[PDB]
Amino acid sequence: EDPLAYYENHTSQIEIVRQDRSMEQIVFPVPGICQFLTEETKHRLFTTTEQDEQGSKVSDFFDQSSFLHNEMEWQRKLRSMPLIYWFSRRMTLWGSISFNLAVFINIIIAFFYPYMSIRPLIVALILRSIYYLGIGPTLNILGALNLTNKIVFVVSFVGNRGTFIRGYKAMVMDMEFLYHVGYILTSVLGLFAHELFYSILLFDLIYREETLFNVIKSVTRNGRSILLTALLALILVYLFSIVGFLFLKDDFILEVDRLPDSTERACDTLLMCIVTVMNHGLRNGGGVGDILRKPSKDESLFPARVVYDLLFFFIVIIIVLNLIFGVIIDTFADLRSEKQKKEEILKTTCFICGLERDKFDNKTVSFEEHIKLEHNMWNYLYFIVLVRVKNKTDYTGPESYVAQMIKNKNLDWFPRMRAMSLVSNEGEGEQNEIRILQDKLNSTMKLVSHLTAQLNELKE
Amino acid sequence: VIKSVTRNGRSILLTALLALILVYLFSIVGFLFLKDDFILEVDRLPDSTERACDTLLMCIVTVMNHGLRNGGGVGDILRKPSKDESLFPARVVYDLLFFFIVIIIVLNLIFGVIIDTFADLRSEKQKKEEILKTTCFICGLERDKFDNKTVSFEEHIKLEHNMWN
Amino acid sequence: VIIDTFADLRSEKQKKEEILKTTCFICGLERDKFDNKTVSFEEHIKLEHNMWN
Amino acid sequence: NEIRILQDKLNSTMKLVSHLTAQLNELKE
Ligand SMILES: Nc1ncnc2c1ncn2[C@@H]1O[C@H](COP(=O)(O)OP(=O)(O)OP(=O)(O)O)[C@@H](O)[C@H]1O
Ligand SMILES: Nc1ncnc2c1ncn2[C@@H]1O[C@H](COP(=O)(O)OP(=O)(O)OP(=O)(O)O)[C@@H](O)[C@H]1O
Ligand SMILES: Nc1ncnc2c1ncn2[C@@H]1O[C@H](COP(=O)(O)OP(=O)(O)OP(=O)(O)O)[C@@H](O)[C@H]1O
Ligand SMILES: [Zn+2]
Ligand SMILES: [Zn+2]
Ligand SMILES: [Zn+2]
């Protein structure tokens, strides 16, 4: 409607650094393709970027610029097809439907197996179907619905993500696609192979919830340390089993129950001793001594038995076992620290230049205004898209220089720790003051020269 | 102390649900294979044993109660197999897996989350106290700036930049 | 005590790694100083202030 | 205040230079 509003919408301003190292401002019309970028992809890129050793995220953004352009092209192509776009828009809804159906099937299986908001309405309908037809028919209907809904969800996922644009090898490489395929296979097995298979779909909950995923990460982040601690515990149990087999063989007596003798020697063979220890002592709070025969005070070896039990309890159980829990707690602390650091850097520094918010205070332009307008990353992405799109013959001075920089694989044109508004105004003021001082000095020198000329003329 | 738990209650509940899912899978495995060994002694008010795994739901309930309440795990209540039994190695493997996954790792996640919540609360309290007691409420200026100057930071807040003024 | 020892070891390792990878070995100058200058910090350590030299 | 003192000194120097130039012009005339 308003020409000025339309032109302002399509106009983007950026700050760049030339070879001379003097900052410059480029105002350009945003390419039409750039508008097609989805905001979900923008948020994912903003939150996913990882700073390099230099402390700048610009390299990853530049690398992902090409993928973003391809995503824009694929989004336009998808817009060309209303039905595929509509399916893509509802991918989350399909995923939720599939998860809810799997949960309902699992609940029914758990409640009645073996056999033979709208969510309350769905539950009532499921109960009515169970009563009218039975558990078998209702489970079959729910399984078929879940399989079809998950297939639709996967179709929408592949359509929306555009991962096929990367290539079929990329499709196979994407872990999420393989996980969805595995979910579909599990649903298929549940529908036909056996109902209990649907229980596996419960693991999908981990993918759905992020807090549970973080709790699991707390363990899997340092899984190698936990496994090594378990191996050390196994080695200690092996040594202790050797000691018991050599010396305490008799005391290894375990009560036994036989299906249609009440005790057995569970340490006849050193391997059997190791197995018995590794099972009972690890499962026993006191240790191996809990299951081993209780020695009387009269027994000569009773002090040795007490020493052995105390050593086992203090080493294998008290210390070694607690190492896994300590490692898990330390992993929790490390994850919390990393998350806090990442959030602070993201929300308190400029993405492009890395400048802190503290610098922009007490100045004409605030930090928020700086990021919103002066140093918007998407403006730089749009400039890159324009440079690629624009013909070389039509390249403007700064545009030609930036295209040459892109060809040279150099990111110097990206500003680093430099902002126009923060330093340029003060520098201009200082330069004006210095120029005034220089003009005064030049006037004084001219007056001195005139006086010298007058003196020379008088002498002559 | 209560906040330390309620602050991240969602994570604790999700960990409990994950433990329930693991117990459900393990109950499925036992019902399919280890159905016989699920024998529990019973006391009757005025048989001394019962099969607590006749139905998969009953197996799930029995595991979720006894194994979670048992330090060793489900294997503590399950019938003890003799070395002669063919399935004894399978029973030992099942018990070890249960103890190492459901009890050793998954259960400790709740305690780790509680400890991490304690640490987060302590850090937040320290940051808030430091900001309150070392910076100006109105202008946010630090106390370090006002030292070596005519007007001290305390005088600045008391008179120059009093919020109530 | 074991948990506190874990935390202390993690803190010491983080501090040592940060100092090693963000400061000059010879002069101790931080990487932040060399930015916005003709010679970068990495170039400084590689050529200007190489310990092996 | 320091900058104002410096500016006053510069203005006095400029006034002296202008007076010298005027005297030279008068002598030439
Ligand atoms: N260089 C940057 N540093 C930090 N945050 C940035 C930077 N560039 C953009 N952001 C933030 O990323 C998000 C993307 O901003 P964007 O300009 O896309 O906003 P928008 O409201 O979708 O756009 P518009 O209203 O101008 O059509 C916003 O939170 C913006 O503050
Ligand atoms: N801007 C500020 N920044 C930090 N602390 C402040 C600020 N303004 C007030 N305070 C503190 O808040 C409390 C309120 O101070 P206030 O002037 O009300 O003191 P008062 O002793 O009750 O008053 P009075 O003695 O002047 O009648 C004091 O601790 C004061 O130091
Ligand atoms: N003063 C220093 N501060 C920090 N790191 C340094 C310093 N001097 C050297 N390094 C690093 O220590 C390692 C040793 O560098 P060195 O010069 O030996 O490299 P090189 O590749 O083996 O040698 P060249 O390629 O020159 O034959 C490199 O990582 C270098 O960056
Ligand atoms: Zn910036
Ligand atoms: Zn103040
Ligand atoms: Zn150096």
UniProtKB/Swiss-Prot annotation, chain C:
Domain of life according to the entry: Eukaryota
Residues the record lists as binding Zn(2+): 24, 27, 44, 49
Entry binding sites for ATP: 24-25, 46, 49-51
Compartments where located: Endoplasmic reticulum membrane; Cytoplasmic vesicle, Secretory vesicle membrane
Tissue-specific expression: Expressed in intestinal crypt and villus epithelial cells.
Post-translational changes noted in the entry: Phosphorylated by AKT1 on serine and/or threonine residues.
Entry remark concerning the domains of this protein: Composed of a large N-terminal cytoplasmic domain (CD) followed by a juxtamembrane domain (JD) and a transmembrane domain (TMD).
Its job: Inositol 1,4,5-trisphosphate-gated calcium channel that, upon 1D-myo-inositol 1,4,5-trisphosphate binding, transports calcium from the endoplasmic reticulum lumen to cytoplasm, thus releasing the intracellular calcium and therefore participates in cellular calcium ion homeostasis.
Disease with which this protein is associated in UniProt: Charcot-Marie-Tooth disease, demyelinating, type 1J: An autosomal dominant demyelinating form of Charcot-Marie-Tooth disease, a disorder of the peripheral nervous system, characterized by progressive weakness and atrophy, initially of the peroneal muscles and later of the distal muscles of the arms. Charcot-Marie-Tooth disease is classified in two main groups on the basis of electrophysiologic properties and histopathology: primary peripheral demyelinating neuropathies (designated CMT1 when they are dominantly inherited) and primary peripheral axonal neuropathies (CMT2).
Subunit structure comment from the entry: Homotetramer. Homodimer. Interacts with TRPC1, TRPC3 and TRPC4. Interacts with TRPV4. Interacts with SIGMAR1. Interacts with PML and AKT1. Interacts with IRAG2 (via coiled-coil domain). Interacts with CABP1. Interacts with TMBIM4/LFG4. Interacts with CEMIP. Interacts with TESPA1. Interacts with TMEM203. Interacts with BOK; regulates ITPR3 expression. Interacts with BCL2L10. Interacts with CHGA and CHGB.
Family the UniProt entry places it in: Belongs to the InsP3 receptor family.
Protein name listed in UniProt: Inositol 1,4,5-trisphosphate-gated calcium channel ITPR3
High-level lineage: Eukaryota, Metazoa, Chordata, Craniata, Vertebrata
Range of the intact protein held here: 2515 to 2567 of 2671
